[model samples]
Target: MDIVFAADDNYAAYLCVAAKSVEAAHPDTEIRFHVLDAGISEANRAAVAANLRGGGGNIRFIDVNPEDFAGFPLNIRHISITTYARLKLGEYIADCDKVLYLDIDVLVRDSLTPLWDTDLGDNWLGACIDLFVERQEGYKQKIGMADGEYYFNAGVLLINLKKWRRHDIFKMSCEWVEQYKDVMQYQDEDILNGLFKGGVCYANSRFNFMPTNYAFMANASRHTDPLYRDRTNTVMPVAVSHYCGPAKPWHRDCTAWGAERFTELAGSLTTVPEEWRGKL
Candidate 1:
């Protein structure tokens, strides 16, 4: 299975560490870590390479000159970065029937093969419902999505590349980003969720589980409810822990539960100094 990620210098260090952790959990999987142009510095690239050298996964650097897409409006540079990565990465998707794309801020705590095995059917992609968005109506209108359809988390996606290319989903998503640049909350994530809403296959929350303590630090107490909590007893260590909010483990004041896991993962894989790192 091919797994993809994009990052910048601030996120590059932790992203590499997350990749290494995923590699350790699924050693036999063919993981592909894609570093976009903005994220790659001479030092950062070397750091990623040095850590993944014997980890049994391939690390590739793809240069995306943001300047090349200058026609996009001024204030939406962040959205453009995501659009460029997904568009450029489309070529890599051509050979694989399906591919999984992850945000750089996530840490994999278990095997992803189960997620890889999911079928997208006629849809161009599949994803988990975003846990943080409580009222579907406002979010739906914000992204121009219809009601009742699953609004997915863009952090973890199970993409059916063949269907995506065949249906022109990637092109359409990029166009949406260009047109709706003003309304985007989380760049490509919002655009893709809006576009793929009705067609998206919802993965079991367990597979895409983001413990409230990690991503939604404020909601950690709410997990006591069986619907939001892991009652299956089978919810193993997270298949992936998504640090979606602003309080990232690397930040000085981050107090999330999984911060230590993120720090430990980074320390084990990279040469970054302890002083430069922080934990939960």
Candidate 2:
């Protein structure tokens, strides 16, 4: 399985934790990690590779030029220019037709075989629906999506590299970024949803479980919002927990739904330094 991650210097440690989680679940499988390097120092790069000791495959870091994403607004909370690095996968990853792109803030509780083996068919991408924008009508209109159409979280994506190149998604995304500068609230995510409007193949919500899903379900039990009832019914154990928004498990104040689980996974990695593991 080929996996992709985009991280800068600050998130290099989290990237190790994320990759180690993947390696932990897929013990016998070959999992190659492609890091979209965004100014990560050499020492940290070595540290990340060293941390992935359990059944780890080759870890390749592809240097990304920040200038390539210049003027791409960093208006999203706690997100940086490195998030845009995933957009360049079509050009960088020629060896694989499909890649699993994950955010550094994510933790894998189970095997990703189900998500990786998902059938995309004619679609350019397979992604889980975004709980954050599940019922936000204004967000739909802001990103040029209509009612009833699904909006996906770009955090956990099963990218079809061949299809991405076939449709020249890279250029289209860049143009979207330039044209919709003022409306780009979610940055690359907004551009991707707008570009593939009704074309995405939706994955199960369990694949990208966020704290929003937990909070919404908790409220759904007490109150009776029809929207909550609909969303709460299909709940499953989180396969991949995405630490969305500014608060992260690495931060001392992080109390997200999966923070404890994330900490547990981090502590399990024997190769990771004690000091770093303690902090996580």
Candidate 3:
């Protein structure tokens, strides 16, 4: 399987942590990780490989010019145009029919074969709904999406590269961002969701469950009914845990379920910068 992550220096550790967790979780499964970055040093690249290749996986690097996406909006702290690199997957990796694109903020806790093996059929991207969908009224309004329309999180995606190139979806996403730069706050996520409105295959929430999911599941597990409790309990017991939004698991602001485990696992995978752990 091919897993891709895009980051500059600011996210190198998180990227490595994410990759390490992915390969660690799938110890027997071989994953060729592709990293697209504007300026990741050779040493940093080597560190990523070391962190991820514990049980024999492969790592590939693709250089990106930050200026190419200079005008793209960046709302997150220290994030740059490089965040848009995932939008250029087809242009960089033309060899694969499909690839799993993961944000640096995620941890892979289960096998991806089930999600990867799921048929895309006619869909261009498979993903979960964004966290706090009801609260994103401004985004839904900016994209001109109607009520009940699916607004997917761009954190974890099973991309259909063939369809992406065939339909020029990546180019269209760039155009969407350029067209709505002022109103679109989530960068590539907004553009992709708007461009591929109807063709998206909504994956189970477990595939990209986020910190919001963690909190919700905690309270939900207290339900009296067996079926309801059982159903809600597994939301965070998902394959991937996405630290989406301001409260990141590594940064210690997020007190979500499994945050401590991710931190503990992080140290084993690679050097956890003290400030990152906030243990200083």
Candidate 4:
């Protein structure tokens, strides 16, 4: 299995902790860490590399230049970087039978073999249902898809490379971005969800569960169920925890239980700088 992560220097510390935890949980899995940044200095790159080295997993670095897609009228360079990473992910996927793509903000809590083993059928992709579909209808139309059609969170994906290449799904995604750049809301994520609307298999929420409520005390108290009490505990250890909310663990004011888990993971790595030590 090929596991890929696209991140930059700002996320280097978190990436290190994520990588270390993933490596520890699944030591036998082969990981290819892809750093997508044009501004990464040699020093920071070395620091990222050194941190992954101790995790006993194979790691590689690649610099992605969003400027290559100058034809697209993207308002922010950061958005362009994200789009490029998502579009270019197909290239790596083409070389393997299966691939799991994860965002930098996620923390793996269990082995990802179950996610990797998910079936995509004739399609080449799979993702979790987008929780905010109803709130973003116009955004959905921009991508040429309807609301409540299994809109997916692009943060995590399982790719069937051979099928994607055979069907030209990657090319289609890039073409939509180039043509509809004006309507894109969340960068490449919107484009991807639109393109794979019918193709993507929606996995169970538990696989890419976001702690919207204190239902899981280890996370925040965002989404609480009236029937459930002491919402601070997990039914069982989760496969992954996505810090998709505004308050990240590294931020100064993060008080989420998930943030606490993130801090613990960050402290275990020696490559983190002292200044950023207490931040996570």
Candidate 3 lDDT tens digits, 1-280: 9888899876776787788788778878878888897798776676667665643248878888888777777787745688778877778887789999998878788888888997999788888766465345556767867544567788889999988777765568777876787787677778888887878877767888776665665452223545333423445448988877777776746676567756767768644444445431
lDDT string, candidate 1, 1-280, tens digits: 6777766666566667777877877877767765555546777777677778454347777666665445444353323353446644555445567778887767777888887888778886877666565333475567677555556667787877777666655567668877777776666566677676678776655555555423443333223444333422225466777766665666776665566777677657546644334421
Q: Name the top TM-score candidate.
A: 2
* Candidate 3 lDDT (Cα, 0 to 1): 0.74
Output the number of the lDDT-best candidate.
Answer: 2
Off by over 4 Å in 1: 53-57, 68-84, 134-137, 167-171, 178-182, 211-236, 273-280
lDDT of 2 by residue, 44-119 (tens): 7877887786334379998888678876788776888888888888987889999999999998877889889998
What are the models' TM-scores? 0.78, 0.90, 0.85, 0.78
Error of 2 at 264 (Å): 2.4
Candidate 3 segments exceeding 4 Å error: 54-57, 218-236, 270-280
**What's the lDDT for candidate 4?**
0.63
Question: Clashing residue pairs, candidate 1?
Answer: none
lDDT of candidate 4 at residue 75, scale 0 to 100? 61
Q: Using lDDT as the measure, name the better of candidate 1 and candidate 2.
A: 2
lDDT for each candidate structure: 0.63, 0.80, 0.74, 0.63
